[PDB]
Amino acid sequence: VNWPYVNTKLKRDPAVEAQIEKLLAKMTIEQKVAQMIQPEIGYLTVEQMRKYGFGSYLNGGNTAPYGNKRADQATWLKYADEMYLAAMDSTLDGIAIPTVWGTDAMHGHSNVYGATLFPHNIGLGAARDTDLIKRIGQATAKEVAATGIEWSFAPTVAVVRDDRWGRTYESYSEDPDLVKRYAGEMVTGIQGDVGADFLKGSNRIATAKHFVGDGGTERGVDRGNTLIDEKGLRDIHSAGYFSAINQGVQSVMASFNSWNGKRVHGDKHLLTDVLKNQLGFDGFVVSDWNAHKFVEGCDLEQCAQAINAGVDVIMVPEHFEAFYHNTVKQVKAGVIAESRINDAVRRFLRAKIRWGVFTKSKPSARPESQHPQWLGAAEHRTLAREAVRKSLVLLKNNESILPIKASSRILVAGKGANAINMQAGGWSVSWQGTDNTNSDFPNATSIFSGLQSQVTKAGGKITLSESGEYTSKPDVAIVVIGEEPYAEWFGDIELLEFQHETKHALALLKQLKADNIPVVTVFLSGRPLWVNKELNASDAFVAAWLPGSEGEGVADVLLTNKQGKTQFDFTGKLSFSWPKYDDQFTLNLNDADYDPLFAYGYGLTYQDNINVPVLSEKTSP
């Protein structure tokens, strides 16, 4: 199987390469290995950084620096300075190579309190807007820079084929063509375009995740087994990497899944022969969180096989010290070649040096560190609100009930009506999102709050009641319902029916319908789900995905302006096929037998006059 060479734009900088060779020539085995190890701040001390001079360290997201839950910019920058100076202290370890701080950036700088939260990828995919993606990358780079961090993990280029996976919402589309179109835009948004501005100023080092096939696991099991021939791995699951590598992405993260029974992190064919030799990726490979422990023969404290397979930087958040000493002994034992550690360090230094770790000042003194307002900037929330508007997909709008006159009397109901944690989903300040409350999102706007602001301005009347209680009978009920927030395997499911165990939202919808109140359903989810029953109980139904912090984007489209005219029409179109039956687990565009309820590319607008009939509510045995 032949893979195409896709590193066609980025040319090496001879000055940078000169510096790498001079450094390598004088470094000890110990110093080289230190560059390859990445501790996490929950476990790392400044003293350990001084002693070892690790090449990077991770903002894992579970705590702010110094243990704070929330921290001023000055506090982030103080922590960054301390680590930077400890690394530049050549005492103890014998060299002065600046370290860098890295962070995951799932939908903005989303581990961080106060960050703008953009819609998760599935909704961005619905938007079909490459320019939007690039601008989101640019905004994200600034918000990351505002915390003193040089390196962010984004884009996520999974191509998801089975929506049972709990990470489905992290994917732009089931369609590789769409992911390919997007991936390079996010990379250049973050890093800058190849050329004079490459990696300059507020631009960050980027990592494209995850290589490869994590969206193709059997039954959508998280970290499961991807059963597909190599041509399929190339043509379906690698499309995002073609454009990300072509745009010069500096880092690639290896994936937790297996391919035909073998863990990717231990697969030299994938991580070296395919990624580096055939595709031509010239940057560095980073592993995922303790992913090395799952490779055959490896454990938390040792994994020569992953290194030998082509991993260049090991994400070992807690066991880094023992991992360090073991790896050094393995190089000395000859079971990890010096040529291999040399190549790992070359690729990693290539990123740090070209970004400018030797030429820029300490973190707190850098120009991109002088703008605390970048974190959650008004301009970025305006961008996110645009993304929200464009992400919404109108599935049903019977008798053109939408858009609703802003001057009407409206009831807003449903568990998601005023719950920012549900609209944001997982990877939002916290991992699962379960414990988030509205106060964890300063300057965000709930869906109710957005509607209320516009209805009040238009002289209408609005009421919030999750359970649908009212005093004055409304002209219409907007009911906001959906999945609870989740991340990773917590979100893996076996059944496609929404709330199959309780049907709590359905009871609410039927209650309102029984009172002859017109119902507009706003559905929050990380994926299409089987919702025929809820659709039947709705006059209109909107797939809003996981819109993030800017909930007023929903009001912008659903409501008229004050004069009663349309302000924004729907523009979004499905990037994942919507199931007609509760057992349509792998429903994908181009499938031989393709029978979706609503196809890839479907999405109504106010210009349509289409009614959706009552649908079958039969479920499988």
Q: Binding-site residues for Ca(2+), please? A: 174, 587-588
Residue 454: what are its φ and ψ, rounded to 5°?
A: -80, -35
What are the DSSP calls for 500-561, one per residue?
TTT-HHHHHHHHHHHTT--EEEEEE-SS--B-HHHHHT-SEEEEEE---SBTHHHHHHHBB-
Exposed, middle or buried: residue 458 (CB in 10 Å: 0-12, 13-18, 19+)? Answer: middle
Pick between residue 49 and residue 64 the one whose CB is nearest to Na ion: 49
Find the shortest distance in angstroms from Cβ 596 to Ca ion. Answer: 8
Pick between residue 452 and residue 577 the one whose CB is nearest to Ca ion: 577
Distance CA 149, CA 369 (A): 9
Find the shortest distance in angstroms from Cβ 227 to Ca ion. Answer: 17
Helices (H), 62-106: 73-88
Window contacting Na ion (CB under 5 A); options: 87-95, 441-449, 533-541, 609-617: 87-95
Instruction: Determine, following the binding rule CB under 5 A, whether residue 30 of this chain makes contact with Na ion.
Output: no
Looking at 347, 577, 582, 612, which residue binds Ca ion (CB under 5 A)? 577
Of these partners, Ca ion, Na ion, none, which one is at the site of residue 162 (CB under 5 to 8 Å by kind)?
none
Cβ(128)–Cβ(182) below 8 Å:
no
Distance CA 138, CA 544 (A): 24
CB atoms within 10 A of CB 219: 14
Find the shortest distance in angstroms from Cβ 380 to Ca ion. Answer: 31
Residue 252: which region, alpha, beta or left (left: phi > 0; alpha: psi -120 to 50)?
Answer: beta
Find the shortest distance in angstroms from Cβ 355 to Na ion. Answer: 18
Whether 81 sits among the annotated catalytic residues: the reply is no
Window contacting Na ion (CB under 5 A); options: 46-54, 109-117, 348-356, 580-588: 46-54
Task: Select the residue whose beta carbon is closest to Ca ion and give its number.
Answer: 174
Task: Select the residue whose beta carbon is closest to Na ion and give its number.
Answer: 53
Angle at 187 between CA 588 and CA 158, to 5 degrees: 25
Cβ(320)–Cβ(39) below 8 Å:
yes
Of these partners, Ca ion, Na ion, none, which one is at the site of residue 93 (CB under 5 to 8 Å by kind)?
Na ion
Instruction: Determine, following the binding rule CB under 5 A, whether residue 534 of this chain makes contact with Na ion.
Output: no
Pick between residue 53 and residue 123 the one whose CB is nearest to Na ion: 53
Window contacting Ca ion (CB under 5 A); options: 41-49, 142-150, 228-236, 588-596: 588-596
Looking at 40, 93, 143, 174, which residue binds Ca ion (CB under 5 A)? 174
Whether 488 sits among the annotated catalytic residues: the reply is yes
Torsion of CA 108, 110, 111, 115, to 10 degrees: 90
Cβ(524)–Cβ(544) below 8 Å:
yes
Looking at 3, 30, 35, 53, which residue binds Na ion (CB under 5 A)? 53
Pick between residue 44 and residue 291 the one whose CB is nearest to Na ion: 44
Closest CA to 436 of 421, 423, 448, 457: 421
Instruction: Determine, following the binding rule CB under 5 A, whether residue 175 of this chain makes contact with Ca ion.
Output: no
Of these partners, Ca ion, Na ion, none, which one is at the site of residue 53 (CB under 5 to 8 Å by kind)?
Na ion
Instruction: Determine, following the binding rule CB under 5 A, whether residue 55 of this chain makes contact with Na ion.
Output: no
Q: Which of 282, 299, 343, 488 is catalytic?
A: 488
The distance of Cα 177 from the centroid of its chain, to the nearest Å, equals: 19
Instruction: Determine, following the binding rule CB under 5 A, whether residue 588 of this chain makes contact with Ca ion.
Output: yes
Find the shortest distance in angstroms from Cβ 93 to Na ion. Answer: 5
**157 upstream amide cis, omega within 30 of 0:** no
Which one-letter amino acid corresponds to residue 369? S
Find the shortest distance in angstroms from Cβ 362 to Na ion. Answer: 14
Cβ(532)–Cβ(615) below 8 Å:
yes
Instruction: Determine, following the binding rule CB under 5 A, whether residue 550 of this chain makes contact with Ca ion.
Output: no
Pick between residue 48 and residue 566 the one whose CB is nearest to Na ion: 48
Q: What are the tokens at 332?
A: 């000395």
Window contacting Na ion (CB under 5 A); options: 53-61, 145-153, 198-206, 596-604: 53-61
Looking at 27, 36, 59, 93, which residue binds Na ion (CB under 5 A)? 93
Cβ(46)–Cβ(284) below 8 Å:
no
* Binding residues for Na ion (CB under 5 A): 53, 93
* Binding residues for Ca ion (CB under 5 A): 174, 577, 587-588
List the catalytic residues. 288, 488
